[PDB]
JSON list of N, CA and C in Angstrom, two decimals:
[
{"chain": "A", "resi": 1, "resn": "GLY", "atom": "N", "xyz": [-4.61, -6.02, 26.94]},
{"chain": "A", "resi": 1, "resn": "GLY", "atom": "CA", "xyz": [-4.67, -6.14, 25.53]},
{"chain": "A", "resi": 1, "resn": "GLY", "atom": "C", "xyz": [-5.53, -5.46, 24.81]},
{"chain": "A", "resi": 2, "resn": "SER", "atom": "N", "xyz": [-5.19, -5.21, 23.43]},
{"chain": "A", "resi": 2, "resn": "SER", "atom": "CA", "xyz": [-6.10, -4.42, 22.14]},
{"chain": "A", "resi": 2, "resn": "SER", "atom": "C", "xyz": [-5.93, -3.10, 22.96]},
{"chain": "A", "resi": 3, "resn": "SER", "atom": "N", "xyz": [-5.45, -1.77, 22.70]},
{"chain": "A", "resi": 3, "resn": "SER", "atom": "CA", "xyz": [-5.16, -1.08, 22.39]},
{"chain": "A", "resi": 3, "resn": "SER", "atom": "C", "xyz": [-4.12, 0.30, 22.06]},
{"chain": "A", "resi": 4, "resn": "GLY", "atom": "N", "xyz": [-5.00, 0.51, 21.15]},
{"chain": "A", "resi": 4, "resn": "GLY", "atom": "CA", "xyz": [-4.47, 1.51, 19.99]},
{"chain": "A", "resi": 4, "resn": "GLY", "atom": "C", "xyz": [-3.42, 2.64, 21.13]},
{"chain": "A", "resi": 5, "resn": "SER", "atom": "N", "xyz": [-2.38, 2.78, 19.64]},
{"chain": "A", "resi": 5, "resn": "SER", "atom": "CA", "xyz": [-1.47, 4.61, 20.85]},
{"chain": "A", "resi": 5, "resn": "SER", "atom": "C", "xyz": [-0.90, 4.96, 19.54]},
{"chain": "A", "resi": 6, "resn": "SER", "atom": "N", "xyz": [-0.45, 4.95, 18.73]},
{"chain": "A", "resi": 6, "resn": "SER", "atom": "CA", "xyz": [0.05, 5.89, 17.93]},
{"chain": "A", "resi": 6, "resn": "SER", "atom": "C", "xyz": [1.17, 6.82, 17.97]},
{"chain": "A", "resi": 7, "resn": "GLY", "atom": "N", "xyz": [1.56, 7.08, 17.37]},
{"chain": "A", "resi": 7, "resn": "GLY", "atom": "CA", "xyz": [3.55, 7.42, 17.33]},
{"chain": "A", "resi": 7, "resn": "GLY", "atom": "C", "xyz": [3.24, 9.08, 17.04]},
{"chain": "A", "resi": 8, "resn": "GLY", "atom": "N", "xyz": [3.55, 9.47, 16.07]},
{"chain": "A", "resi": 8, "resn": "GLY", "atom": "CA", "xyz": [3.66, 10.18, 15.07]},
{"chain": "A", "resi": 8, "resn": "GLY", "atom": "C", "xyz": [2.23, 10.82, 14.14]},
{"chain": "A", "resi": 9, "resn": "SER", "atom": "N", "xyz": [1.49, 12.13, 14.58]},
{"chain": "A", "resi": 9, "resn": "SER", "atom": "CA", "xyz": [0.55, 11.75, 13.73]},
{"chain": "A", "resi": 9, "resn": "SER", "atom": "C", "xyz": [1.18, 13.16, 12.72]},
{"chain": "A", "resi": 10, "resn": "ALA", "atom": "N", "xyz": [1.01, 12.65, 11.24]},
{"chain": "A", "resi": 10, "resn": "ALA", "atom": "CA", "xyz": [0.99, 12.87, 10.49]},
{"chain": "A", "resi": 10, "resn": "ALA", "atom": "C", "xyz": [0.70, 13.09, 8.79]},
{"chain": "A", "resi": 11, "resn": "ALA", "atom": "N", "xyz": [-0.45, 12.40, 8.58]},
{"chain": "A", "resi": 11, "resn": "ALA", "atom": "CA", "xyz": [-1.06, 12.68, 7.13]},
{"chain": "A", "resi": 11, "resn": "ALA", "atom": "C", "xyz": [-0.68, 10.09, 8.05]},
{"chain": "A", "resi": 12, "resn": "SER", "atom": "N", "xyz": [-1.71, 10.00, 8.28]},
{"chain": "A", "resi": 12, "resn": "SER", "atom": "CA", "xyz": [-1.72, 8.51, 8.95]},
{"chain": "A", "resi": 12, "resn": "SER", "atom": "C", "xyz": [-3.22, 7.38, 7.70]},
{"chain": "A", "resi": 13, "resn": "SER", "atom": "N", "xyz": [-4.15, 8.57, 8.96]},
{"chain": "A", "resi": 13, "resn": "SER", "atom": "CA", "xyz": [-6.29, 8.53, 8.03]},
{"chain": "A", "resi": 13, "resn": "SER", "atom": "C", "xyz": [-5.72, 8.43, 6.54]},
{"chain": "A", "resi": 14, "resn": "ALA", "atom": "N", "xyz": [-5.86, 8.46, 5.53]},
{"chain": "A", "resi": 14, "resn": "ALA", "atom": "CA", "xyz": [-5.40, 8.86, 4.04]},
{"chain": "A", "resi": 14, "resn": "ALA", "atom": "C", "xyz": [-4.93, 8.40, 3.80]},
{"chain": "A", "resi": 15, "resn": "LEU", "atom": "N", "xyz": [-3.46, 8.08, 4.13]},
{"chain": "A", "resi": 15, "resn": "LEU", "atom": "CA", "xyz": [-2.57, 7.04, 3.79]},
{"chain": "A", "resi": 15, "resn": "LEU", "atom": "C", "xyz": [-3.52, 5.52, 3.93]},
{"chain": "A", "resi": 16, "resn": "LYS", "atom": "N", "xyz": [-3.49, 5.32, 4.79]},
{"chain": "A", "resi": 16, "resn": "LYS", "atom": "CA", "xyz": [-4.59, 3.86, 5.79]},
{"chain": "A", "resi": 16, "resn": "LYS", "atom": "C", "xyz": [-5.33, 3.63, 4.14]},
{"chain": "A", "resi": 17, "resn": "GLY", "atom": "N", "xyz": [-5.87, 5.04, 3.81]},
{"chain": "A", "resi": 17, "resn": "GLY", "atom": "CA", "xyz": [-7.02, 4.26, 2.40]},
{"chain": "A", "resi": 17, "resn": "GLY", "atom": "C", "xyz": [-5.93, 3.91, 1.22]},
{"chain": "A", "resi": 18, "resn": "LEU", "atom": "N", "xyz": [-4.99, 4.66, 1.14]},
{"chain": "A", "resi": 18, "resn": "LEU", "atom": "CA", "xyz": [-4.67, 4.15, -0.39]},
{"chain": "A", "resi": 18, "resn": "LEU", "atom": "C", "xyz": [-3.84, 2.96, 0.48]},
{"chain": "A", "resi": 19, "resn": "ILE", "atom": "N", "xyz": [-3.43, 2.63, 1.21]},
{"chain": "A", "resi": 19, "resn": "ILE", "atom": "CA", "xyz": [-3.09, 1.05, 1.56]},
{"chain": "A", "resi": 19, "resn": "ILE", "atom": "C", "xyz": [-4.32, 0.07, 0.93]},
{"chain": "A", "resi": 20, "resn": "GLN", "atom": "N", "xyz": [-4.81, 0.21, 2.26]},
{"chain": "A", "resi": 20, "resn": "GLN", "atom": "CA", "xyz": [-6.05, -0.62, 1.85]},
{"chain": "A", "resi": 20, "resn": "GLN", "atom": "C", "xyz": [-6.64, -0.57, 0.26]},
{"chain": "A", "resi": 21, "resn": "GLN", "atom": "N", "xyz": [-6.14, 0.68, -0.90]},
{"chain": "A", "resi": 21, "resn": "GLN", "atom": "CA", "xyz": [-6.85, 0.49, -1.80]},
{"chain": "A", "resi": 21, "resn": "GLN", "atom": "C", "xyz": [-4.50, -0.53, -2.89]},
{"chain": "A", "resi": 22, "resn": "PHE", "atom": "N", "xyz": [-5.20, -0.30, -2.33]},
{"chain": "A", "resi": 22, "resn": "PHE", "atom": "CA", "xyz": [-2.98, -1.03, -1.89]},
{"chain": "A", "resi": 22, "resn": "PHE", "atom": "C", "xyz": [-3.63, -2.40, -2.06]},
{"chain": "A", "resi": 23, "resn": "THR", "atom": "N", "xyz": [-3.19, -3.05, -0.98]},
{"chain": "A", "resi": 23, "resn": "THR", "atom": "CA", "xyz": [-3.77, -4.16, -0.21]},
{"chain": "A", "resi": 23, "resn": "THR", "atom": "C", "xyz": [-4.28, -4.66, -0.99]},
{"chain": "A", "resi": 24, "resn": "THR", "atom": "N", "xyz": [-6.22, -4.17, -1.92]},
{"chain": "A", "resi": 24, "resn": "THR", "atom": "CA", "xyz": [-6.91, -4.67, -1.36]},
{"chain": "A", "resi": 24, "resn": "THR", "atom": "C", "xyz": [-6.57, -5.14, -3.69]},
{"chain": "A", "resi": 25, "resn": "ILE", "atom": "N", "xyz": [-6.18, -3.89, -4.37]},
{"chain": "A", "resi": 25, "resn": "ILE", "atom": "CA", "xyz": [-6.19, -4.66, -5.57]},
{"chain": "A", "resi": 25, "resn": "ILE", "atom": "C", "xyz": [-4.78, -4.64, -5.75]},
{"chain": "A", "resi": 26, "resn": "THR", "atom": "N", "xyz": [-4.12, -5.13, -4.23]},
{"chain": "A", "resi": 26, "resn": "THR", "atom": "CA", "xyz": [-2.33, -5.99, -5.14]},
{"chain": "A", "resi": 26, "resn": "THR", "atom": "C", "xyz": [-3.09, -7.44, -4.65]},
{"chain": "A", "resi": 27, "resn": "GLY", "atom": "N", "xyz": [-2.90, -7.19, -3.17]},
{"chain": "A", "resi": 27, "resn": "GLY", "atom": "CA", "xyz": [-3.16, -7.92, -1.98]},
{"chain": "A", "resi": 27, "resn": "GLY", "atom": "C", "xyz": [-2.33, -8.38, -1.52]},
{"chain": "A", "resi": 28, "resn": "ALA", "atom": "N", "xyz": [-1.66, -6.67, -0.80]},
{"chain": "A", "resi": 28, "resn": "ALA", "atom": "CA", "xyz": [0.00, -7.09, -0.21]},
{"chain": "A", "resi": 28, "resn": "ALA", "atom": "C", "xyz": [-1.08, -6.23, 1.68]},
{"chain": "A", "resi": 29, "resn": "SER", "atom": "N", "xyz": [0.06, -6.86, 1.96]},
{"chain": "A", "resi": 29, "resn": "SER", "atom": "CA", "xyz": [-0.38, -6.12, 3.76]},
{"chain": "A", "resi": 29, "resn": "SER", "atom": "C", "xyz": [0.53, -4.24, 3.59]},
{"chain": "A", "resi": 30, "resn": "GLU", "atom": "N", "xyz": [-0.85, -4.50, 4.82]},
{"chain": "A", "resi": 30, "resn": "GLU", "atom": "CA", "xyz": [-0.34, -2.45, 4.81]},
{"chain": "A", "resi": 30, "resn": "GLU", "atom": "C", "xyz": [0.91, -2.49, 4.94]},
{"chain": "A", "resi": 31, "resn": "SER", "atom": "N", "xyz": [1.51, -2.60, 5.25]},
{"chain": "A", "resi": 31, "resn": "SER", "atom": "CA", "xyz": [3.08, -2.70, 6.02]},
{"chain": "A", "resi": 31, "resn": "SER", "atom": "C", "xyz": [3.56, -2.34, 4.45]},
{"chain": "A", "resi": 32, "resn": "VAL", "atom": "N", "xyz": [3.06, -3.45, 3.67]},
{"chain": "A", "resi": 32, "resn": "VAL", "atom": "CA", "xyz": [4.12, -3.53, 1.91]},
{"chain": "A", "resi": 32, "resn": "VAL", "atom": "C", "xyz": [3.24, -1.81, 1.60]},
{"chain": "A", "resi": 33, "resn": "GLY", "atom": "N", "xyz": [1.94, -1.85, 1.17]},
{"chain": "A", "resi": 33, "resn": "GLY", "atom": "CA", "xyz": [1.67, -0.49, 0.78]},
{"chain": "A", "resi": 33, "resn": "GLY", "atom": "C", "xyz": [2.03, 0.62, 1.27]},
{"chain": "A", "resi": 34, "resn": "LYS", "atom": "N", "xyz": [2.65, 0.50, 2.75]},
{"chain": "A", "resi": 34, "resn": "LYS", "atom": "CA", "xyz": [2.21, 1.83, 3.03]},
{"chain": "A", "resi": 34, "resn": "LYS", "atom": "C", "xyz": [4.01, 2.52, 2.57]},
{"chain": "A", "resi": 35, "resn": "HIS", "atom": "N", "xyz": [5.30, 0.75, 1.76]},
{"chain": "A", "resi": 35, "resn": "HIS", "atom": "CA", "xyz": [6.26, 1.38, 1.77]},
{"chain": "A", "resi": 35, "resn": "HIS", "atom": "C", "xyz": [6.26, 1.50, 0.17]},
{"chain": "A", "resi": 36, "resn": "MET", "atom": "N", "xyz": [5.81, 0.45, -0.22]},
{"chain": "A", "resi": 36, "resn": "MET", "atom": "CA", "xyz": [5.18, 1.42, -2.12]},
{"chain": "A", "resi": 36, "resn": "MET", "atom": "C", "xyz": [4.89, 2.33, -2.13]},
{"chain": "A", "resi": 37, "resn": "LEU", "atom": "N", "xyz": [3.31, 3.08, -1.07]},
{"chain": "A", "resi": 37, "resn": "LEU", "atom": "CA", "xyz": [2.88, 4.64, -1.53]},
{"chain": "A", "resi": 37, "resn": "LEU", "atom": "C", "xyz": [3.59, 5.48, -1.09]},
{"chain": "A", "resi": 38, "resn": "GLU", "atom": "N", "xyz": [4.92, 5.34, -0.37]},
{"chain": "A", "resi": 38, "resn": "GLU", "atom": "CA", "xyz": [5.67, 6.18, 0.26]},
{"chain": "A", "resi": 38, "resn": "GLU", "atom": "C", "xyz": [7.26, 6.00, -0.05]},
{"chain": "A", "resi": 39, "resn": "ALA", "atom": "N", "xyz": [7.14, 5.42, -1.47]},
{"chain": "A", "resi": 39, "resn": "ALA", "atom": "CA", "xyz": [8.49, 5.57, -2.29]},
{"chain": "A", "resi": 39, "resn": "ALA", "atom": "C", "xyz": [7.61, 6.43, -4.27]},
{"chain": "A", "resi": 40, "resn": "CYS", "atom": "N", "xyz": [6.18, 6.21, -3.20]},
{"chain": "A", "resi": 40, "resn": "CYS", "atom": "CA", "xyz": [4.85, 6.08, -5.14]},
{"chain": "A", "resi": 40, "resn": "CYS", "atom": "C", "xyz": [3.83, 8.43, -4.49]},
{"chain": "A", "resi": 41, "resn": "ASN", "atom": "N", "xyz": [4.88, 8.47, -3.10]},
{"chain": "A", "resi": 41, "resn": "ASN", "atom": "CA", "xyz": [4.19, 10.47, -2.36]},
{"chain": "A", "resi": 41, "resn": "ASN", "atom": "C", "xyz": [3.47, 10.07, -2.03]},
{"chain": "A", "resi": 42, "resn": "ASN", "atom": "N", "xyz": [2.88, 9.30, -2.07]},
{"chain": "A", "resi": 42, "resn": "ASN", "atom": "CA", "xyz": [1.67, 7.97, -1.48]},
{"chain": "A", "resi": 42, "resn": "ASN", "atom": "C", "xyz": [0.87, 8.35, -2.36]},
{"chain": "A", "resi": 43, "resn": "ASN", "atom": "N", "xyz": [1.32, 7.38, -4.73]},
{"chain": "A", "resi": 43, "resn": "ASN", "atom": "CA", "xyz": [-0.42, 7.69, -4.99]},
{"chain": "A", "resi": 43, "resn": "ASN", "atom": "C", "xyz": [0.33, 5.71, -5.57]},
{"chain": "A", "resi": 44, "resn": "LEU", "atom": "N", "xyz": [-1.73, 5.92, -5.35]},
{"chain": "A", "resi": 44, "resn": "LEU", "atom": "CA", "xyz": [-1.50, 3.98, -5.17]},
{"chain": "A", "resi": 44, "resn": "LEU", "atom": "C", "xyz": [-1.09, 3.54, -5.80]},
{"chain": "A", "resi": 45, "resn": "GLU", "atom": "N", "xyz": [-1.84, 4.60, -7.89]},
{"chain": "A", "resi": 45, "resn": "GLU", "atom": "CA", "xyz": [-1.68, 4.01, -8.92]},
{"chain": "A", "resi": 45, "resn": "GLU", "atom": "C", "xyz": [-0.21, 3.58, -9.55]},
{"chain": "A", "resi": 46, "resn": "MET", "atom": "N", "xyz": [1.06, 4.23, -8.51]},
{"chain": "A", "resi": 46, "resn": "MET", "atom": "CA", "xyz": [1.87, 4.94, -8.71]},
{"chain": "A", "resi": 46, "resn": "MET", "atom": "C", "xyz": [2.86, 2.92, -8.89]},
{"chain": "A", "resi": 47, "resn": "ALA", "atom": "N", "xyz": [2.04, 3.10, -6.92]},
{"chain": "A", "resi": 47, "resn": "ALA", "atom": "CA", "xyz": [2.66, 1.31, -6.15]},
{"chain": "A", "resi": 47, "resn": "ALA", "atom": "C", "xyz": [2.56, 0.81, -6.70]},
{"chain": "A", "resi": 48, "resn": "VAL", "atom": "N", "xyz": [0.53, 0.62, -7.14]},
{"chain": "A", "resi": 48, "resn": "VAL", "atom": "CA", "xyz": [0.42, -1.15, -8.19]},
{"chain": "A", "resi": 48, "resn": "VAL", "atom": "C", "xyz": [1.35, -0.80, -9.21]},
{"chain": "A", "resi": 49, "resn": "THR", "atom": "N", "xyz": [1.94, 0.82, -10.10]},
{"chain": "A", "resi": 49, "resn": "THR", "atom": "CA", "xyz": [2.40, 0.22, -11.19]},
{"chain": "A", "resi": 49, "resn": "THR", "atom": "C", "xyz": [3.40, 0.30, -10.17]},
{"chain": "A", "resi": 50, "resn": "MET", "atom": "N", "xyz": [4.11, 0.00, -9.40]},
{"chain": "A", "resi": 50, "resn": "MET", "atom": "CA", "xyz": [4.85, -0.26, -9.44]},
{"chain": "A", "resi": 50, "resn": "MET", "atom": "C", "xyz": [5.46, -1.88, -8.29]},
{"chain": "A", "resi": 51, "resn": "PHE", "atom": "N", "xyz": [4.58, -2.07, -7.86]},
{"chain": "A", "resi": 51, "resn": "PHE", "atom": "CA", "xyz": [4.46, -3.18, -7.14]},
{"chain": "A", "resi": 51, "resn": "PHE", "atom": "C", "xyz": [4.18, -4.48, -8.50]},
{"chain": "A", "resi": 52, "resn": "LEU", "atom": "N", "xyz": [3.23, -3.66, -9.09]},
{"chain": "A", "resi": 52, "resn": "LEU", "atom": "CA", "xyz": [2.78, -4.90, -10.05]},
{"chain": "A", "resi": 52, "resn": "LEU", "atom": "C", "xyz": [3.63, -5.08, -10.82]},
{"chain": "A", "resi": 53, "resn": "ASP", "atom": "N", "xyz": [4.73, -4.36, -11.18]},
{"chain": "A", "resi": 53, "resn": "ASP", "atom": "CA", "xyz": [5.44, -4.03, -12.77]},
{"chain": "A", "resi": 53, "resn": "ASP", "atom": "C", "xyz": [6.71, -4.97, -11.93]},
{"chain": "A", "resi": 54, "resn": "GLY", "atom": "N", "xyz": [7.30, -4.71, -10.57]},
{"chain": "A", "resi": 54, "resn": "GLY", "atom": "CA", "xyz": [8.03, -4.93, -10.00]},
{"chain": "A", "resi": 54, "resn": "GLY", "atom": "C", "xyz": [7.81, -6.91, -9.42]},
{"chain": "A", "resi": 55, "resn": "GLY", "atom": "N", "xyz": [7.10, -7.98, -9.73]},
{"chain": "A", "resi": 55, "resn": "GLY", "atom": "CA", "xyz": [6.46, -8.94, -8.80]},
{"chain": "A", "resi": 55, "resn": "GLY", "atom": "C", "xyz": [5.18, -9.60, -9.54]},
{"chain": "A", "resi": 56, "resn": "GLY", "atom": "N", "xyz": [5.48, -10.34, -10.43]},
{"chain": "A", "resi": 56, "resn": "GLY", "atom": "CA", "xyz": [4.25, -9.82, -11.07]},
{"chain": "A", "resi": 56, "resn": "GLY", "atom": "C", "xyz": [3.89, -11.51, -10.92]},
{"chain": "A", "resi": 57, "resn": "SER", "atom": "N", "xyz": [3.21, -11.50, -10.02]},
{"chain": "A", "resi": 57, "resn": "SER", "atom": "CA", "xyz": [2.63, -12.94, -9.59]},
{"chain": "A", "resi": 57, "resn": "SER", "atom": "C", "xyz": [2.21, -13.67, -8.24]},
{"chain": "A", "resi": 58, "resn": "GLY", "atom": "N", "xyz": [0.79, -14.31, -9.21]},
{"chain": "A", "resi": 58, "resn": "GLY", "atom": "CA", "xyz": [-0.87, -14.31, -7.89]},
{"chain": "A", "resi": 58, "resn": "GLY", "atom": "C", "xyz": [0.19, -15.96, -7.34]},
{"chain": "A", "resi": 59, "resn": "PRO", "atom": "N", "xyz": [-1.24, -17.14, -6.27]},
{"chain": "A", "resi": 59, "resn": "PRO", "atom": "CA", "xyz": [-0.74, -17.10, -5.61]},
{"chain": "A", "resi": 59, "resn": "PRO", "atom": "C", "xyz": [-0.88, -18.69, -6.61]},
{"chain": "A", "resi": 60, "resn": "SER", "atom": "N", "xyz": [-2.23, -18.65, -7.66]},
{"chain": "A", "resi": 60, "resn": "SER", "atom": "CA", "xyz": [-2.35, -19.31, -10.04]},
{"chain": "A", "resi": 60, "resn": "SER", "atom": "C", "xyz": [-3.56, -17.95, -9.78]},
{"chain": "A", "resi": 61, "resn": "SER", "atom": "N", "xyz": [-2.14, -18.19, -11.09]},
{"chain": "A", "resi": 61, "resn": "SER", "atom": "CA", "xyz": [-3.40, -17.20, -12.10]},
{"chain": "A", "resi": 61, "resn": "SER", "atom": "C", "xyz": [-2.23, -17.90, -14.10]},
{"chain": "A", "resi": 62, "resn": "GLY", "atom": "N", "xyz": [-3.23, -17.85, -14.27]},
{"chain": "A", "resi": 62, "resn": "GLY", "atom": "CA", "xyz": [-2.88, -18.39, -15.99]},
{"chain": "A", "resi": 62, "resn": "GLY", "atom": "C", "xyz": [-3.59, -18.31, -17.42]}
]
């Protein structure tokens, strides 16, 4: 068990970076941050602004 594989090698490390910022800022998962950043040309600011606007409700805040 526990063994990396990786498929395609084209913009991953960087992507992660942002993803991390997203999964951290927002609190979503990577896969999500990857989908959000994937629709934001890999732009956290956008992904965030996008995800945020599109679904603004935490676990317990107000």
